[PDB]
Structure formats: structure tokens, C-alpha cells
Amino acid sequence: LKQLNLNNEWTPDKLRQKLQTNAHNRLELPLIMLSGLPDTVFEITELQSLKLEIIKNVMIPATIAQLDNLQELCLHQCSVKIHSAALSFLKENLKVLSVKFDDMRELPPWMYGLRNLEELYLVGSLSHDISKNVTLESLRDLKSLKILSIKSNVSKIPQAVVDVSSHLQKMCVHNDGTKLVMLNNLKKMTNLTELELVHCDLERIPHAVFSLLSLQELDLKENNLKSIEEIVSFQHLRKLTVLKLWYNSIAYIPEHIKKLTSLERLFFSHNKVEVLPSHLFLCNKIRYLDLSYNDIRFIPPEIGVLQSLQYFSITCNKVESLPDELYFCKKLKTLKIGKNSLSVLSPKIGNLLFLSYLDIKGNHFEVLPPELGDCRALKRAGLVVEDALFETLPSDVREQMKAD
Amino acid sequence: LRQLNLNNEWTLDKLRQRLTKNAQDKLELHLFMLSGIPDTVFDLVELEVLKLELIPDVTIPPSIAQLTGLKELWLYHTAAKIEAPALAFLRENLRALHIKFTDIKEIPLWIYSLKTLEELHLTGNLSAENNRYIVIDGLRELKRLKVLRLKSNLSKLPQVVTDVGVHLQKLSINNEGTKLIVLNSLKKMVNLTELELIRCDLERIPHSIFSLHNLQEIDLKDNNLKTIEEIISFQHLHRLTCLKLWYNHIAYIPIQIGNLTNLERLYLNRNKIEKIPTQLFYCRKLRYLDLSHNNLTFLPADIGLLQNLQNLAVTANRIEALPPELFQCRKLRALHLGNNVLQSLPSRVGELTNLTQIELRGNRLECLPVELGECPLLKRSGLVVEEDLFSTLPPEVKERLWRADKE
């Protein structure tokens, strides 16, 4: 009767109305707080992604073999059951999975019989006995898994990840105030390329990250890095171009930055840095450097070395002096110097040909120079400023600027 | 009592709301699990498509004459019992008829007596004992037939359809992976204009496809052709302007397609093309080009030749950098560039004005350039991208885009 009601309740036209897209550009069916799964849903064969939210006591029939176009499955806070043909087909076809385990049993045990699975979104929560989750350490049956994002209060990285390190590539963990420990399980990462740890309460960068020899990027989000002294081994991460250490507490930046020059993306926004050294800008390959909402006293002139820079954010700083060598670097596409203690915008600013973005919002300026016309890629939107600074262009310059 | 109750239950008012529109923009009502056709349904006079789907053995009354605009009937597993006045009205009015059946008895015999019928669609296996291509012998009575879709899993085209093909202009065959025995038997339908072999699993092109001179659109959907080698003979097809070779194992494009200069809608998507070559761009007439879900190494420079290109679709292919020659053309309208490995979008997109939508979600897109705001036709619905990447744009240009969007 439940299944008959489901088929009767939801006509295929209603499902056409429900059809939408998702965060991964797939045809999604958002099913919210349903009694079950109708067969009318499986009658749709153009479907690319299924979204089942708190639809519990649900058994997946063979009828899902109708829709071959599935690539993503969203099994959110729902205890789902299975059938043999469904196991075979979702072993053959399903690749992207996004489940939420509000309850541990609301995580079903059959995710791990698959092999074609590639993306996994393990949002939810976990208890103290982390290692007892045999559900995690069955991903040895998964061969194609490449994306793993676990938003949970996970203190110990499981031996599951240790086993699946050969083919896994991306980590995204949100502990939300929970300390992460037992970092040997992240040491025995070998082929991993991306690591985004959020609120893991890692006081120091472990030797786990340096044991990784092919890490494309690292995120130490919401992690209390008071000092950065283990960067000496960071040279082993030759693939490391992204170091997004933002909202952090790095009080000063040492010479150890010379260990790696392949670094390209560098986010130290809201950091505790007081004065930049002479030793950051030696690594000329850096293009993407962030110091947003910091409190730097002033900018030393060694910034002239960073020529291949294309992004230099120091917004909301206490910087009162911008030397003209950052204006000398013309490859600097983005350059955000907003809400600092600077005085006057540089008159010789039109020399920067490739200056796409100059966020200098809230800076205490007096009068804009007339050489903004010489700037090829700076706009009113790009040069975000208070309006009493916008009102300062000469009339012929207004005629040339309203027409860009 | 049931029919009288149904007339009361399904009222004209609720059915006016039930009225919807299809892809052909035609007012239509979908009758699902109805006991019969309510008289409130037949009272409607603005109806264009009446959907008798799963209506058990319903007798059509003469009041169908009230359906003056009625041109489309889709009898889906619905045997229609009809009498002489309704027959006359359907013969004089009705012109398109998509009969879906699971049995020979489900197919009504009066559908072969309609004069004005021009579009006829069959779904359901037609291979049977002592009835193979004999039940449709009444297709000779139908002289106005122009569209004949046969989703019948048939192994060979019937000869009665070949005699019909003198006046037939469109023949689409769906066999669901069954090889249709061509034997160059389609040379009789010289009037054929759109041969859409859907899921025919041919794996080759027979000579009858390029023997007829009247085909403009030839879509070999899921025909599983390994090598596209019969395209040299298609240059005699001056009418041919839409050669949709999607859903095949074409692993490489030979240079010989540069012979076919008349092509406009070359949809070559969902294949394993390692690369579209420069000689492929030798067809400057190409206006619509689809290469989505392919194995391209990159996108060459000779795309600057295709000045008429409007929608270039390379979604989920392997293109690392966008060439400026792509932006050299100004007629681009729908850029399906999402799910790619595009490192960044060049500012030359500001040159594009006809661009009304561009798929930029996913990819390796570092930031969206401000020049996207220079495009007038582009709006928020057109510019589909992640929220953070959209927020990378300056606030005021985003406000401009918002204001141009909502109004």
C-alpha cells in the first residue's frame, strides 16, 4: 500500500516539476521527507542524480536499472535497504555519493560493496570509538574513489584512509572544535594530492604532511598554528602550490619559506603576522598571495622580487607605506590593499598594464590621479573605494572612462 | 454510473487547469488512469493534443466533433472504439497520431482510414507470426503521411512503408540495439528528408543513406559507427546541413570531412574523439557545433574560421587552455564550457556580445574576469557558476547583472 500510494501520489509530471540541477551539474530530484521511493521516480531515465532526504525504511528495487544516466546519489539521513540487481547496477554505474549520517545506523552498510564510486561526502558526526567503524574500512572494495570529504567530529583518522591511500586524492574534514589526533594514519598517505583540514585543532604541522610527496595543496583551516617551524620538510611537497593558512595565528614568517619555491597559492588572511620578512618574495613562482584582514605595520620594498605574482592581498592592514616596486611589478593582476593606512594613490599607476583587480577599499585617500586611464584593467568596480574618492576624475577623463 | 460520476468528478474548470503545453507548444491534457474520456474533456474546444493513455477500452463518442482544434492523439495502451461520425470528424480533422501498443489487437484498424494523417509514431515490437508487415497494409490508403516513427525493434523495413515513402518525408527507426537489414532497400523513399536511425546499432553506413538526395538531417543516434568513412559521398547531398554523429565509437575524425562544406548543425557529442582537427574547421558554414563528453586533447586555432558558430559545447572534455581564436568569433551564444580543465577564462570573452548563456560551473576556473560584465545579453541565469566564483566579481558589476536579471 505504501509503494502503491507513492506511485499514485507522485505523477511523472510532478517529477518533471521537481527536476532541477545540483552543485555538480547533474539532473537532481530533490525528495524531501518522503514515505518511500516511488517507482515513478525510476520511470524517469534521463535522471543524473538522486536526492533522498530523511526517507527512511526504504528498499531499493531492481527498477533503478531503468535509469542508466545516474552519476550522483544523495542519501541524506536515511536508512536505505537494497536488492541484488540494485547492488550489481550501482556497482557498475554509480560513482558519486553524498550521504549524511545523523545516526550511525542511518549510514547504511552497503555503500562499500561498490567499486565504481569516485566521490564521497561523509557529512555528519562520530562518537568516541572511532576505530570500531568497520563501515569505514570496507572502502578497500572501492577502486575508483578519488574525493572524500568528511564533515564530522573525527578525532582519529581511521585505518580506512590508510588502506585507501593508494587511489584517494582529496580530503575535506570539518571537526568543528574537535581535536584531531593519531596523525600516523595521515602519515601513511602516499598518493594523496589534496588535504583540507578544518578545525582539526592541529597545533603543529605534522610529519604526516611531509611524508606526502605528491600533495598538490594543503589546507590547515581553523587550526591553531601559533608558529611555523616545521616548513623545512615542506620542500618534499614539490607538487604543493596552494598553502591556504587563513584565519590563522602565524605571528611572524621565518626564512624556512625558501625550502619550497614551487608554491603558487598563498593564503595567510587574518593571520597574526606583524612584519613580512625579506625571505617570502624570493620564491618568484608565487602568483597568489593573501594577507586579508591582517595587521601588518608596513610593507618592505623586497616585494619587488615577486614579479610573477598575480595576486597580492593585504586588505585591512595597518600598512601606511606602499613602496613603488609593487607598482613596478606589472604582471600583478590582482592586488588588494584595502583599508590600510596609506595616504595617496600612486600617480604613476598606469604603468601596471596587467592589473586586473586593485581592491583598495576604505583606504584614506585624498584625490585620484588622472592616470587611471593609462591603467588598462582597472575599473570603479576593481578600484573599490569610498564614493568621495570616486568623484575625483577630470571631466575629459570622465568622458574617456565612462566609455572605458 | 461510473461514466456519469466521472463527468461530475473531472469538471471543465479543474481540466482547464489540467491543460498544459508540450515541446511543440501545443495545449494538451494528460488523461492517466481514467475510466473513460469525461464529457467535460470533450467540451473543451481549444485542445490540441488529447492524451488517451491507459484508458481501458474507451468508446469514442461523436462529441469528439466538439474538439474542433484536435490534431494530435497519443493512444498509449488505449484501444479506441469508434463509430462513423467520430470517424468522419477524425478523418477530416486529425493529422498526427502516435499509437503506442503492446499487442496487434491494441492497434485500431480505423487509424489506417484517416485521410489527413501526416505524423504516425509506433512503439512496440512488430515481429509476429502471419502479421509481419501485413497489419500496416492500410498505409497505402494514407497518402498524406510524412512522418513515420517506428520504435518497433523491427529487423527490416517493410515494403508497404517503401511504397508509402513516395510521399513520406521523415522516417525515424528505433530498434533498441537490433541491426536493421538494410540491403539498400531505402532507395525507394526518394522523398525522405530526415532519416533518424535511433539506436539502430548499424556500426556501418549503408549506401542507401547517401543514395537518396533529399536528406537534410541525418542523425545516426547510437548507431555505434566505429569509423566515419562514408562522408565523402555525402557532398552530393546538397540538402544535407545537419549530420549529427553522436553516441558512437568514432575515435578519430579523418580529414575528408573537409569536403562537406554545407554542414551547419554538426553534433558530434558523447563520443571518444581524441581531437577535432583543423580540417574539421574547413566547414565555415558550421553554425551549431556540439562536442560534449569527448576525449579532445585541446581546441585548435582554426575555430576562428567558424564565424557563424553560435553554441560550441565541449562540456566535460579535456581542454586545458581556452585559445583566443575561440573569442575571435563574435557570434557565440551558448558556451557549454563547464566541467572542464580550463585553467582560466581569458578577458577576451568581453568581446562576445551574442553570448546569452555560458556554462562555467566546475572546471579549474581561478576567477571570473570583469569583462563578463561587458556582455549585455548575459545574465545570472545565463552565467551559471559557483557562488564563490561569482562573488569574486566586484560588488557593483554584480549589482548591474542582478538588476539586468530581475527587472
Residues of B whose CB is below 8 A from A23: 386
In DSSP terms, which residues pair with A244 in a beta bridge? Answer: A219, A267
Comparing alpha-carbon positions, the chain A residue that sits nearest to B32 is A11
Q: Please list the alpha-helical segments (H only) found in B201-262.
A: none
Asked whether the beta carbons of A306 and A328 are under 8 A apart, the reply is no
| Other beta carbons within 10 Å of B112 | 17
Comparing alpha-carbon positions, the chain B residue that sits nearest to A8 is B33
CATH numeric code, B269-407: 3.80.10.10
In DSSP terms, which residues pair with B214 in a beta bridge? Answer: none
Task: Return the residue in B317, B348, B361, B364 with the most chain A beta carbons within 10 A, the one to mutate for interface testing.
Answer: B361
Q: Do B395 and A24 touch (CB under 8 A)?
A: no
Rounded CA-CA distance B70/B80 in Å is 16
Asked whether the beta carbons of B175 and B154 are under 8 A apart, the reply is yes
Cell representation of residue A261: 619555491
The answer to whether B20 faces chain A, any CB pair under 8 Å, is yes
The answer to whether B158 faces chain A, any CB pair under 8 Å, is no
Backbone angles phi, psi at A132, to 5 degrees: -80, -10
| Other beta carbons within 10 Å of A15 | 17
Q: State the virtual CA torsion across A75, A81, A85, A86 in degrees, nearest 10.
A: 0
Residues of A whose CB is below 8 A from B32: 11
Residues whose CB is less than 8 angstroms from the CB of residue A386 and which lie 6 or more positions away in sequence, other chains included: A361, A362
- Tell me which DSSP letter residue B234 carries: G
Comparing alpha-carbon positions, the chain A residue that sits nearest to B366 is A288
Residue A182 belongs to what domain range? 46-402
Q: Do B370 and A356 touch (CB under 8 A)?
A: yes
Reported in sequence order, the residue ranges of A125-247 that DSSP labels E, i.e. its strands, are 147-150, 170-174, 194-198, 217-221, 242-244
Rounded CA-CA distance A293/B229 in Å is 62
Rounded CA-CA distance A370/B207 in Å is 71
Place of cell 545574465: B379
Residues of A whose CB is below 8 A from B347: 356, 377
Backbone angles phi, psi at A111, to 5 degrees: -60, -20
Chain centroid, CA B21 distance in Å:
17
Reported in sequence order, the residue ranges of B227-340 that DSSP labels E, i.e. its strands, are 242-244, 265-267, 288-290, 311-313, 334-336
Rounded CA-CA distance A211/A224 in Å is 21
Residues whose CB is less than 8 angstroms from the CB of residue A124 and which lie 6 or more positions away in sequence, other chains included: A99, A100, A101, A102, A107, A151, A152
- Tell me which DSSP letter residue B58 carries: P
Q: How many domains does chain A have?
A: 1
Rounded CA-CA distance B160/B158 in Å is 5
Specify the experimental method: cryo-EM
In DSSP terms, which residues pair with A49 in a beta bridge? Answer: A28, A72
Domain membership of residue A68 (yes or no) is yes
The answer to whether A24 faces chain B, any CB pair under 8 Å, is yes
Q: Out of A11, A356, A380, whose CB is closest to B369?
A: A356
Rounded CA-CA distance B400/A312 in Å is 26
| Other beta carbons within 10 Å of A32 | 11
CATH code of the domain containing A355: 3.80.10.10
Rounded CA-CA distance B169/A72 in Å is 41
Q: Do B397 and A381 touch (CB under 8 A)?
A: yes
Rounded CA-CA distance A319/A297 in Å is 5
Q: Do B394 and A379 touch (CB under 8 A)?
A: yes
The answer to whether A46 faces chain B, any CB pair under 8 Å, is no
Rounded CA-CA distance B24/B402 in Å is 31
Cell representation of residue B224: 555505434
In DSSP terms, which residues pair with B81 in a beta bridge? Answer: B59
Residues whose CB is less than 8 angstroms from the CB of residue B407 and which lie 6 or more positions away in sequence, other chains included: none
Residues of B whose CB is below 8 A from A25: 315, 338-339, 359, 361-362
Q: Out of A11, A25, A384, whose CB is closest to B338?
A: A25
DSSP tally for chain A: helices H, then strands E: 10, 17
Rounded CA-CA distance B283/B280 in Å is 7
β A96-101/A119-124 pair status: parallel
The answer to whether A376 faces chain B, any CB pair under 8 Å, is no
Asked whether the beta carbons of B148 and B174 are under 8 A apart, the reply is no
Rounded CA-CA distance B290/B246 in Å is 9
Reported in sequence order, the residue ranges of B302-384 that DSSP labels E, i.e. its strands, are 311-313, 334-336, 357-359, 383-384
Asked whether the beta carbons of B165 and B143 are under 8 A apart, the reply is no
Task: Return the residue in A170, A289, A357 with the most chain B beta carbons within 10 A, the one to mutate for interface testing.
Answer: A357
A-B CB pairs within 8 A amount to 35
Dmax (CA) of chain B? 74
Q: Quick one: which H or E segment has residue A84?
A: helix A84-92
What ranges do the domains of chain B cover?
A: 269-407
Domain membership of residue A87 (yes or no) is yes
Residues whose CB is less than 8 angstroms from the CB of residue A338 and which lie 6 or more positions away in sequence, other chains included: A315, A316, A359, A360, A361, A362, A363, A384
Q: Out of A11, A25, A384, whose CB is closest to B339?
A: A25
| Sign of the dihedral defined by the CA atoms of residues B327, B332, B333, B334, in that order | negative
β A80-81/A96-101 pair status: unpaired
Residues whose CB is less than 8 angstroms from the CB of residue A329 and which lie 6 or more positions away in sequence, other chains included: A303, A304, A306, A307, A309, A352
Q: Quick one: which H or E segment has residue A327?
A: helix A325-328
